[PDB]
Amino acid sequence: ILPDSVDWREKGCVTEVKYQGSCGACWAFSAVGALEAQLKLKTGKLVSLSAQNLVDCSTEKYGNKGCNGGFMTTAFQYIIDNKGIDSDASYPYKAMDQKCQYDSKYRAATCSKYTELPYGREDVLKEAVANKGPVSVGVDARHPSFFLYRSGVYYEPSCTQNVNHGVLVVGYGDLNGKEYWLVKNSWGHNFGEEGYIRMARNKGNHCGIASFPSYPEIE
Ligand SMILES: CNC(=O)O[C@H]1COc2ccc(N3CCN(C4COC4)CC3)cc2[C@@H]1NC(=O)c1ccc(F)cc1
């Protein structure tokens, strides 16, 4: 039995919404948001982690291309290999590709492992969001309805299961009969419901939300 609804924001495991600007660093934002939750669960401290560190440092060896896109899984692998990631404060986001400037003097978190969930399985995603923490996922965001979303449960009949934008599932629920995933985006507070979008849940892997989910853990 899983809870009927989950909201990790209420358990203090979610940092302020970030603003990626012109740079396709959604994957980095998704990755740090997932690790921020684990850091809080382990240490009690909620600390924004450096998306810029990932953009600049988890690069070709990780199949990542900074502002041109990347993968949350290989971002986790970089944090494992690197033995750390800097705080956002120390290594701020600039919405552009820079030289790697990782400095262990400002290490704010580590990662020991990550787990990838099976393709399209919204049940397995629900279990992880309930039992483990916020989960990094991709979605198909290439529709004007997504960009223009303001409120309620988002459903786009033209959506596909092929992902192109990284976001973070921080919960799930039901809004007057419409089941949803509660998603933290990185398009600032101006987007959606103060930075969040509620996306259709149990609607055949809508927009690919359960196509490629993953989450990190800290030893
Ligand atoms: C800017 N958008 C952005 O980064 O979106 C992220 C969102 O998260 C995910 C999650 C899963 C996947 N999968 C793709 C398919 N792959 C299967 C295995 O064999 C094919 C599994 C992993 C892709 C992505 C996206 N990455 C890119 O599209 C991307 C774009 C340019 C790059 F250089 C690198 C990456």
Side-chain angles (χ1 to χ4, degrees), residues 63-75:
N64 298 327
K65 299 182 183 152
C67 289
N68 290 321
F71 306 96
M72 300 78 76
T73 54
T74 66

Side-chain angles (χ1 to χ4, degrees), residues 106-116:
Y106 301 101
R107 187 203 282 115
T110 63
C111 175
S112 63
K113 65 181 282 184
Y114 67 92
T115 301
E116 291 174 274

